[PDB]
């Protein structure tokens, strides 16, 4: 199977309330293991997984220094971006940052990425070639100019092809029992009449990993998109996730509708009928 590691960085300015609020979280696929908070009393990188507490002091304090370098970076990025859009200092703004690498079944380098976003909208992102960039607006073109003239994209590809992938292999070994697991979703459907001639058919999928899953409804072969009530994949809090879809059907023709669950943990795509 394929695995991934991602780091997420969020900085929100506080006009007239001091420093900006910085938060950083690291992930291995859909499993969190590190995290930092600017308002926490610890003021250092904290573990958020049992298999990551095995690290020594060099690893712990070494990442606290790098998350502080990322925090002060966004602190300066807010003032620079504020001038790119001619904004005042009385408004709060958000800069978002994420990068990481992917590995396949053989745990070889799949794809590396690094993207920025200012106030929700995309700003700049490293392409798949890991050497050229993609500027969203003209304000991002200014950032592209400074980073291509300094040739700073090659050191990024050096980190995405080495330190990221090589240390991603380590976590998959130290947390082998928790990371290289694939739990099949527990599927079922519920029936509840909402009106005299209407009923709600909710297709369920519980306790699955990873979180990516596809639950779809079909009526005798044709798929439903406008009537299907889909909610985002929610986590149960124990590592596994949940998801349900629903369609309101006239009472009496429920035998025509069928739910289809697609998940990698399933040996074959299963179908629930009536």
């Amino acid at each position: 199977g394929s695995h991934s590691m991602r780091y997420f960085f969020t900085s929100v300015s506080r006009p007239g309330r001091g420093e900006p609020r910085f938060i950083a979280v690291g992930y291995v696929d859909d499993t969190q293991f590190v995290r930092f908070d600017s308002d926490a009393a610890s003021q250092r990188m904290e573990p958020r997984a049992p298999w990551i507490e095995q690290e020594g002091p060099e690893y712990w304090d070494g990442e606290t220094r790098k998350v502080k370098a990322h925090s002060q970076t966004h602190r300066v990025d807010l003032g620079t971006l504020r001038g790119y859009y001619n904004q005042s200092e009385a408004g709060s703004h958000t800069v978002q940052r994420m990068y990481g690498c992917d590995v396949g079944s053989d745990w070889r380098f799949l794809r590396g990425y690094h993207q920025y976003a200012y106030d929700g909208k995309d700003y700049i992102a490293l392409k798949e070639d890991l050497r050229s960039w993609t500027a969203a607006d003209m304000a991002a073109q200014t950032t592209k100019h400074k980073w291509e003239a300094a040739h700073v994209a090659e050191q990024l590809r050096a980190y995405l092809e080495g330190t990221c992938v090589e240390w991603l292999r380590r976590y998959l070994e130290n947390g082998k029992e928790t990371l290289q697991r694939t739990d099949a979703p527990k599927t079922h459907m519920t029936h509840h009449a909402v009106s005299d001639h209407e009923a709600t058919l909710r297709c369920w999928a519980l306790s699955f990993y990873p979180a990516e899953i596809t639950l779809t409804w079909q009526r005798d072969g044709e798929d439903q998109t406008q009537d299907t009530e889909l909610v985002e994949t929610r986590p149960a809090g124990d590592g596994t996730f949940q998801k349900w879809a629903a369609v309101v059907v006239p009472s009496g023709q429920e035998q025509r509708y069928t739910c289809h669950v697609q998940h990698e943990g399933l040996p074959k795509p299963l179908t629930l009928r009536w």
Binding site: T10, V12, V25, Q32, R35, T94, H192, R234, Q242
Partner: protein, 100 residues
């Protein structure tokens, strides 16, 4: 300035059963910006032992949070999640539907 309505989901970690301690989760996702008030309701009042997950976001740069606490389900006690955001005119409250 992009704004997105949050997606509230009040649910339990395990199938609910009266007399067995469980966990009540209020999953908020797909919102922007990050500033948001999330409160869990106990019989009409607020739970003060609420723990929350760490702030993260998705590919669309929309944030998501997981608020959870330990509780004992009961048919008499009512639960809900009070969420307040800049996109919401009034404080939206989603009641937990045990059977769905």
């Amino acid at each position: 300035m992009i704004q997105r309505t949050p997606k509230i989901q009040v649910y339990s970690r395990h199938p609910a059963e009266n007399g067995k301690s469980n966990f009540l989760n209020c999953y908020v996702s797909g919102f922007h910006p990050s500033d948001i008030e999330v409160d869990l309701l106990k019989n009409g009042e607020r739970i003060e032992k609420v723990e929350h997950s760490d702030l993260s976001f998705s590919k669309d740069w929309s944030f998501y949070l997981l608020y959870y606490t330990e509780f004992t389900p009961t048919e008499k006690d009512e639960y809900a999640c009070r969420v307040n955001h800049v996109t919401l005119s009034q404080p939206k409250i989603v009641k937990w539907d045990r059977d769905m």
